[model samples]
Target: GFCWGDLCVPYGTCSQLPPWLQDMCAAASFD
Candidate 1:
């Protein structure tokens, strides 16, 4: 399920991420 020009990121130091990215981090599983 990929999209054109879709952005991706990791969630280890998620808190340091951007506002929108912070939301994605919360929605992803860390363990």
Candidate 2:
């Protein structure tokens, strides 16, 4: 799992994120 702000979600999977976050997930490269 990984932390994207206050929420902890499965690595590479942003399904749990809010709609706005999910929309930006692809553009937010962790590296």
Candidate 3:
């Protein structure tokens, strides 16, 4: 897991991140 902006966003799951984060994440991610 790593930090995203102000939250520790895990690479395996989308941590309710921003649109840009979720955009590519949704395309190819774990959760």
| lDDT, candidates in the order shown | 0.53, 0.57, 0.60
Tell me the tens digit of each residue's lDDT in model 2 across 1-31: 3466877654455676777876555454352
Q: Encode model 1's per-residue lDDT on 1-31: one tens digit a residue.
A: 1223554344454678777876667654342
lDDT per residue for candidate 3 within 1-31, as digits (tens), equals: 4446678555655567777877766654543
| Model 3, total clashes | 0
Q: Model 1: how far is 7 from its true place, Å?
A: 14
- lDDT top scorer: 3
Q: Which ranges in model 2 have alpha carbons more than 4 Å from their true place?
A: 1-11, 29-31
Candidate with more favorable, higher TM-score: 2 or 3: 2
Candidate 3 Cα errors over 4 Å, as ranges: 1-12
Q: How accurate locally is residue 10 in candidate 2, as Cα lDDT from 0 to 100?
A: 44
In angstroms, the error of model 1 at 12 is: 3.8
Error of 2 at 4 (Å): 11
